[PDB]
């Protein structure tokens, strides 16, 4: 599966390691939120990450379906 990732600093799409067929987004607020917006975390996983208090989580299976908010899922 090809998936957006926040590892690189110009966010790119990468083929994911074997066994990890899932994409995910995570979004929440820092103490920098009012001046930088919400934190964004992108990558792959074997199972979807558990949700904690006050954060969004998205999952999917097609390619590039976890885009940056300022981006589109092309």
């Amino acid at each position, epitope marked *: 599966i090809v998936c957006h990732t*926040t590892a690189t600093s110009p966010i790119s799409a990468v083929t994911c390691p074997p066994g990890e067929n899932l994409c995910y987004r995570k979004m929440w607020c*820092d*103490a920098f939120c009012s001046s930088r917006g*919400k934190v964004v975390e992108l990558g792959c996983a074997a199972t979807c990450p558990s949700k904690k208090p006050y954060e969004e989580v998205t999952c999917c299976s097609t390619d590039k379906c976890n885009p940056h908010p300022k981006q589109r899922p092309g």
Partner: antibody, heavy 126, light 108 residues
Framework: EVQLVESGGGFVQPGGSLRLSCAAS????????MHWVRQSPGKGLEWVSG???????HYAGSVKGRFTISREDAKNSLDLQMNNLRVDDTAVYFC????????????????????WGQGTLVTVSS | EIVLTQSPSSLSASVGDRVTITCQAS??????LNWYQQKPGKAPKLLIY???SLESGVPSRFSGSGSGTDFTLTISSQQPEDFATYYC?????????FGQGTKVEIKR
């Protein structure tokens, strides 16, 4: 797992030379701002040098003109050449990665120091 | 250069105590302050950034308050794992600077 390993520390006479090398596992350090922070009793934790995510070198005042930092691609390592060493440079030297956080506004570097190496000792004495 | 001074330098506490360390800067740094934990013979570990945000994996009993020149690190329920030396670090101006450090010792 992500980790930092540093080497080259030792024990030299004032005016001598040393070279510290730092390698990473789990990430490419040229993606991040790398730093060197030294620790000794009498001066505490002190920022020393830095090689940012663009290849630029940075140095603290008390060490500029004597230290040099560079990517050595053929070694997959971060090197710190320490020349004209003096006694107060005796400390434990840490190789450190700066945090790279993504927001809806962009990427922000070195807000903090998230990954620290184990530390290598540098002794300068008569 | 911005100067950081922690208070106190040493403090005793029992398991279950509420521990409070303060950190003061030579001028305003907004909330660009980090907190690190260090055990002897070991590298420091990042605990707080942005003066208040916990780094992933850190237990929620840690909390950080403060903006401007006065900052606070608080352990609500002291555990044995939490006996170490704590450092604050500012990331507002260059160069980065740390406090002298504060050791949390076991009361008996």
């Amino acid at each position: 797992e992500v980790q930092l390993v540093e080497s080259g520390g030792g024990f030299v006479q004032p005016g001598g030379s040393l070279r510290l090398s730092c390698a990473a596992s789990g990430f490419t350090f040229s993606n991040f701002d790398m730093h060197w922070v030294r620790q000794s009793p009498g001066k505490g934790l002190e920022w020393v040098s830095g090689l940012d995510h663009s290849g630029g070198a940075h140095y603290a005042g008390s060490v500029k003109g004597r230290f040099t930092i560079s990517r050595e691609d053929a070694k997959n390592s971060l090197d710190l050449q320490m020349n004209n060493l003096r006694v107060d440079d005796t400390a434990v030297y840490f190789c450190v990665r700066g945090t790279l956080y993504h927001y809806t506004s962009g990427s922000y570097y070195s807000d903090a120091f998230d990954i620290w190496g184990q530390g290598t000792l540098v002794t300068v004495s008569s | 250069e911005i100067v950081l001074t922690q208070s106190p330098s040493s403090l005793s506490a029992s398991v279950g105590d509420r521990v409070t360390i303060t950190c003061q800067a030579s001028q305003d740094i907004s909330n660009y302050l980090n907190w690190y934990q260090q055990k002897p013979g070991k590298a420091p570990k990042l605990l707080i950034y942005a003066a208040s945000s916990l780094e992933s994996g850190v237990p929620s009993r840690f909390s950080g308050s403060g903006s401007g020149t006065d900052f606070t690190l608080t352990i609500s329920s002291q555990q044995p794992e939490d006996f170490a030396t704590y450092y604050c670090q500012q990331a507002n101006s260059f160069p980065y600077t740390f406090g002298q450090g504060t050791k949390v010792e076991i009361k008996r």
